[PDB]
Amino acid sequence: MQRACEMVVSLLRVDALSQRCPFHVLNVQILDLLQREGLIRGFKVDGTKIDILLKHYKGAPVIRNIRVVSKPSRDIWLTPHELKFRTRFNTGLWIMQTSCGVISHRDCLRMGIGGKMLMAINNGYQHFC
Amino acid sequence: IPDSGMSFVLANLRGSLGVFLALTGHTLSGPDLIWSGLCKHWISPEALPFLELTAEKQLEVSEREAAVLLEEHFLDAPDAYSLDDWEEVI
Amino acid sequence: DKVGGNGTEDLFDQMACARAGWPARTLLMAMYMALGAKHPAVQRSRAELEVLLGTDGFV
Amino acid sequence: LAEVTEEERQKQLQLYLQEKRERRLRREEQLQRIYDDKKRRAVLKDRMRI
């Protein structure tokens, strides 16, 4: 959780081809979700560090914003019908951790399972806590 | 035996060059591939990162325009051909 | 699932306690100490032990 | 009410069986993974102590 909140900084770099972040299995899973969503070009696992190769488009980076929801000092959980309202009318990615793995808010909404909201990527200005 | 279309590739060559290759286990390297016809083009690996970085105009040009843009990375191979004076005998 | 060593304290007990004993282990430890680290036989035996146990190449 | 209760009893029994089986499978997977991890760690530590 601390490692993910740290990796936010490494992900929000600009004018950089690649940036390093602390290693953790949770970081690896979030990176898997990001690559499946096509937000990073890739990443590499090197011992204590992970090297994220970032993706750009027309100069600007693909990742334009990261909003942290669940911090190590405060969990945030949502029922399906609260997640629907909170993610209403937004194309951003809200990362959710559930008993079924680290998935997207859209997978969580289709599954109707209760989840923990970790991060919001390219969510514009949409947050509640 | 050859598989995965290797027989087709060999048979699509001029004369019995493919048969000779498959039977004698002859090794052809470099521009020999271009002159035999196995490989169409001669492009350096340095283009692949270049293509990754510059493929954003494929969506600014039309499909045919993008297809022609791909050809900027084709180079001119050396004229040397190992089997130049052996195709007739083969 | 079959795991253990010594006969009374298994490998899961050897891992947990630093005072646990194992005569088979101490035989090799004593041989290494009585021959010397630089001994070619000792070096060969230690390399063989690491490889056979399958813990070589660990980082 | 008897008819509805028969239906509800069937539903509850099926739900209970499903949940029990899947939780058992998850626990088996976790136990197998952790056991293999400890199995390799123990041999590694024993070699280091040797």
Binding site: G47 | E46 | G57, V59 | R40, R41, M48
Partner: peptide, 30 residues
Amino acid sequence: KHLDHVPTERARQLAEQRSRVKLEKEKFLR
């Protein structure tokens, strides 16, 4: 923590050695 297993470049290099030459860029003068 020193007995954990995490993929590493040292591990990859050791595996390859059990089984890296740098190259200069070409000039394309012609």
